[PDB]
Design a protein around this ligand. Structure first.
Ligand SMILES: [Mg+2]
Ligand SMILES: [Mg+2]
Ligand SMILES: [Mg+2]
Ligand SMILES: [Mg+2]
Ligand SMILES: [Mg+2]
Ligand SMILES: [Mg+2]
Ligand SMILES: [Mg+2]
Ligand SMILES: [Mg+2]
Ligand SMILES: [Mg+2]
Ligand SMILES: [Mg+2]
Ligand SMILES: [Mg+2]
Ligand SMILES: [Mg+2]
Ligand SMILES: [Mg+2]
Ligand SMILES: [Mg+2]
Ligand SMILES: [Mg+2]
Ligand SMILES: [Mg+2]
Ligand SMILES: [Mg+2]
Ligand SMILES: [Mg+2]
Ligand SMILES: [Mg+2]
Ligand SMILES: [Mg+2]
Ligand SMILES: [Mg+2]
Ligand SMILES: [Mg+2]
Ligand SMILES: [Mg+2]
Ligand SMILES: [Mg+2]
Ligand SMILES: [Mg+2]
Lengths: 122, 205, 80, 82, 156, 129
RNA sequence: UAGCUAGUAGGUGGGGUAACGGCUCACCUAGGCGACGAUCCCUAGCUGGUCUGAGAGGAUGACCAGCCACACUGGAACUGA
RNA sequence: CCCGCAGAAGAAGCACCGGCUAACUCCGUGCCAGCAGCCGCGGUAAUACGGAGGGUGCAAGCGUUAAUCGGAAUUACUGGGCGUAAAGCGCACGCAGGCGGUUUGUUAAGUCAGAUGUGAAAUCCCCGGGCUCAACCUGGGAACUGCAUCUGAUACUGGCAAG
């Protein structure tokens, strides 16, 4: 606090870690489904939340949520994952991107279609 | 780009008359001006603070036919310019070419004026201008070219304008169909129902 | 009149050469405290007239050794 | 050697040349010793388009500066016009 | 003549043997624009009653403020519990660039051009209290001249 | 240790104002005398009186108007731990020009306004509002 | 990462450079750097600028321009202004 | 760039609508399916899921993710604190270091003042000008908060000398 003290030893900037460190400051990343499963939510939620453990192109083994009703994913299925946590599931930091490499868009969606990789119905 | 949807809808949502129709027949006859648009129109929820500011901004934008990026740019310009910010913004909006033609009266609506400008009916200083956002300068005469001078719509529009209250800051000749933009309008010349402090606050959120 | 600097002789062991601290009383960029910073310079002195701890005025010159590009002009305040 | 020449600036299809004194080795728009004028070939009427600092140019020539064909032409035009 | 406006209405609990008893507290602030501002808290079992009580309180315990041409007279600090407040005499036409509660109290007071910030806690009740305190603790050039024993021209 | 006499003097003045004491006394110094003179000129105190030969004591007579202190606030600025110097264009305006700032310039200790008029900076000793 | 350095630090004389110089060599002196961070480790081309911010600052160095370094990797010289 | 031809003709989507945050209803499911930036929603009347109608905001774009600054006075020089919220070494001595009562003299290092040189051009800002307008291009200024040198001032701080 004393100016002399500051001169001797200045103030450390508070290094804020990223909450999506497997991306490595990339907006998306490609990966291979190591394992596809359902899991129980955190404390006041009830569900079987769909999630895939994915080995990324840059070495990292993360787990990624799979949003939307129903999915075609299985083991060895290349999907795009993005940034975003599911809160009520512990340790899930990434969503899969629907509508890329090997992940389908949600069926019969008419709203938020861009969010669920759904093409314009005729 | 342009707003292409229902116009009386815009007026109803805002509350005021935005002059989005020619005004031969009154808007109370054209729509339920008191009731808001949609299933839940009669219900009127109480607007907090953000909402009121947003509504004011929407009103002004709708009245003139400026999209958000353009409006924001205009605001930036007003702030940059010396003097009062709201007044500057209003002056710029008025300066717009479509607005000037409408004020002169070579079009029933702002839409009509813009269409004419687009379709190359309007000369600024004897030079065909095509842009509705074209800033007119002081002492600039702007006239209908003869090809658009034969339009019955144009003559009808002139009559309608004659019905309306004529603006002091321009001087327009109906037979010659040319008007001289003598000076940038004063705030006293513009409408009192338009509030600028709300708009300024909104763009200073 | 020539550009010249004053400084204390921190050592004079190496023959024909002295090291001359040139303390300058600079202000700190951020905190505003005035901190004493030092600039040691190896200075050439012929005849080895200077002692350790003295005060000596020096000027810049063509390099006389790997580290020695300053020469002394006059010794002053040579008390012990 | 040192030369006195136009440097291309402006937009696509709308060149505006800054006449600069510069060591010929330097790139056209790169390092330059002194900027001694401008020339605007699409310049409209009631605009000069050209502006040559003649005294500086003369001084540089005396020092030994070669002149681009275009710059020479500009100088000739300026003298006639003025 | 008196412009008045309610800043915040807040729900409070007492927790009795039966269960909880809720009630509403309304903090209002009134002022004449010409300089005079006064805030009032108020508490009641229902919202409208609380606001009315608040209005009465506000109308009483007002305080006069020396305003120079619709803005402050000098940079002023204001303190209270959480509320550390800064307020600056900004140029005519800037408008009031000031937080929520702050904006309300200033507006009713009649300052049209100020730059404020609420540091520390921004708890409405304390920040309004702080702002009013700050406004009072602000003398005019006539007042400073009187205290120091000079003319206003000597002070500038 | 006593490390800042001017600061001590300022503190004494503030405490006197708080406690409604008529006069405040302290060991006199030349800088202190100059500061006192400046304060008197600007009218934040009624008078000062240096008294003694071997170790003289400055006695300031404090100023009251309506029950409250004339010296509303009085803060040290330059201090031994951190000296502050300003240029003539950077000279501060205390309380937007109502209060004064005592600045020690090349031509002696004077108020900020006087220094500004002269066209010279110096050590900003203290603000008074 | 708390000790580092033997052409190391300085001198004399030869040699070398377009040029001063441990640049190089022989001898002489025993120095030189270091808590105002040497040495060692990690990261990084630098600046005008850019973004942001009331400012003070923070982050950054794509495009345009100045400077530096590199040309498969590691060494070397020749020609030549 | 201009002139002529035909005919509304070839040209509107994306997100959101529980609060923060502008915009609400019905149907389907029934802690499931699903949503989510935060807080939260869903266990059979869901304005929070999915569809529909209606509405709101942007618009040739609109959303999501990543990244930097802001808000964050949340590294607090401007601009924080330490009894009980995180924070006074268990207590002392003490070198380097930081700070130094009061008077006079001297110095002018800090400090302050004026001048001179430089601080490339571009960029930013200001008044203009040119592309139909704008973006864009561009003239002239201002600015480049800096650094150096010379000549001054003697309050304060430093040095030196006596008290
Ligand atoms: Mg549950
Ligand atoms: Mg567009
Ligand atoms: Mg802004
Ligand atoms: Mg030798
Ligand atoms: Mg690298
Ligand atoms: Mg800030
Ligand atoms: Mg590149
Ligand atoms: Mg090689
Ligand atoms: Mg050769
Ligand atoms: Mg709402
Ligand atoms: Mg549930
Ligand atoms: Mg949703
Ligand atoms: Mg239902
Ligand atoms: Mg939700
Ligand atoms: Mg839904
Ligand atoms: Mg801070
Ligand atoms: Mg804290
Ligand atoms: Mg505890
Ligand atoms: Mg203790
Ligand atoms: Mg002393
Ligand atoms: Mg000392
Ligand atoms: Mg000096
Ligand atoms: Mg123009
Ligand atoms: Mg420049
Ligand atoms: Mg002294």
């Amino acid at each position: 606090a004393t100016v002399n003290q500051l001169v001797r030893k200045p103030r450390a900037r508070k290094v804020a870690k990223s909450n999506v460190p497997a991306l490595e400051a990339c907006p998306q990343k490609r990966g291979v489904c190591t394992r596809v499963y359902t899991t129980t939510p955190k404390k006041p939620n009830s569900a079987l939340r769909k999630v895939c453990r994915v080995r990324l192109t840059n070495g990292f083994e993360v787990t990624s949520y799979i949003g939307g009703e129903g999915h075609n994913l299985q083991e060895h299925s290349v999907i795009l994952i993005r940034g975003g946590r599911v809160k009520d599931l512990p340790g899930v930091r990434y969503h899969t991107v629907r509508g890329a490499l090997d992940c389908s868009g949600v069926k019969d969606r008419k709203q938020a279609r861009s969010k669920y990789g759904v093409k314009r119905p005729k | 780009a342009r707003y292409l949807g229902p116009k009386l809808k815009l007026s109803r949502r805002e509350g005021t008359d935005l002059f989005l129709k020619s005004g031969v027949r009154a808007i109370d006859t054209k729509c339920k001006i008191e009731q808001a648009p949609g299933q839940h129109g009669a219900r009127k929820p109480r607007l907090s603070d953000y909402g009121v500011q947003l509504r004011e901004k929407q009103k002004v934008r709708r009245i003139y036919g400026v999209l958000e990026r353009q409006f924001r740019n205009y605001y930036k310009e007003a702030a940059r310019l010396k003097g009062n910010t709201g007044e500057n913004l209003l002056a710029l909006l008025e300066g717009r070419l479509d607005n000037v033609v409408y004020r002169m009266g070579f079009g029933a609506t702002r839409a009509e004026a813009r269409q004419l400008v687009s379709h190359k009916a309007i000369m600024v200083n004897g030079r065909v201008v095509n842009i509705a956002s074209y800033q007119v300068s002081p002492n600039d005469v702007v006239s209908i070219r003869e090809k658009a001078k034969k339009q019955s719509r144009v003559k009808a529009a002139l009559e309608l304008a004659e019905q309306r209250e004529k603006p002091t800051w321009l001087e327009v000749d109906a037979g010659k169909m040319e008007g001289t933009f003598k000076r940038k309008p004063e705030r006293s010349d513009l409408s009192a129902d338009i509030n600028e402090h709300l708009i300024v606050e909104l763009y200073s959120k | 009149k020539i550009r010249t600097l004053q400084g204390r002789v921190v050592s004079d062991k190496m023959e024909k050469s002295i090291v001359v601290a040139i303390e300058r009383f600079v202000k700190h960029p951020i905190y505003g405290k005035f901190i004493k910073r030092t600039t040691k310079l190896h200075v050439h002195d012929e005849n080895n007239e200077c002692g350790i701890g003295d005060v000596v005025e020096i000027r810049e010159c063509r390099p006389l050794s790997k580290t020695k590009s300053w020469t002394l002009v006059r010794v002053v305040e040579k008390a012990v | 050697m040192v030369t006195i020449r136009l440097a291309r600036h402006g937009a696509k299809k709308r060149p505006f040349y800054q006449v600069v004194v510069a060591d010929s080795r330097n790139a056209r728009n790169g390092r330059f010793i002194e900027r001694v004028g401008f020339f605007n070939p699409i310049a409209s009427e009631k605009e000069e388009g050209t502006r040559l600092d003649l005294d500086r140019i003369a001084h540089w020539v005396g020092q030994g500066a070669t002149i681009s064909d275009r710059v020479a032409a500009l100088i000739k035009e300026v003298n006639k016009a003025a | 003549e008196l412009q008045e406006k309610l800043i915040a209405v807040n729900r409070v609990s007492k927790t009795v043997k039966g269960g909880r008893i809720f009630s509403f507290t309304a903090l209002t602030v009134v002022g004449d624009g010409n300089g005079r501002v006064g805030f009032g808290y108020g508490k009641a079992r229902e919202v409208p009653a609380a606001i009315q009580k608040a209005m009465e309180k506000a109308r009483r315990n007002m305080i006069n403020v020396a305003l120079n041409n619709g803005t402050l007279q000098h940079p002023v600090k204001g303190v209270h519990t959480g509320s550390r407040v800064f307020m600056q005499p900004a140029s005519e036409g800037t408008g009031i660039i000031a937080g929520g509660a702050m904006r309300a109290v200033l507006e009713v007071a009649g300052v049209h051009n100020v730059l404020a910030k609420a540091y520390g806690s921004t708890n409405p009740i304390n920040v309004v209290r702080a702002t009013i305190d700050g406004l009072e603790n602000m003398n005019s050039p006539a007042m400073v001249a009187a205290k120091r024993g000079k003319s206003v021209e000597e002070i500038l | 240790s006593m490390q800042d006499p001017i600061a001590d003097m300022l503190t004494r003045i503030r405490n006197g104002q708080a406690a409604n004491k008529a006069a405040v006394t302290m060991p006199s110094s030349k800088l202190k005398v100059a500061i006192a003179n400046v304060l008197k000129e600007e009218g934040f105190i009624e008078d000062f009186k240096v008294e003694g030969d071997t170790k003289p004591e400055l006695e300031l007579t404090l100023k009251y108007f309506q029950g409250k202190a004339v010296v509303e606030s009085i803060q040290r600025v330059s201090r031994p731990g951190l000296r502050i110097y300003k240029r003539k264009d950077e000279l501060p305006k205390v309380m937007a020009g109502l209060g004064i700032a005592v600045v020690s310039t090349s031509k002696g200790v004077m108020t900020d306004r006087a220094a500004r008029q002269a066209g010279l900076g110096g050590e900003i000793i203290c603000y008074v509002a």
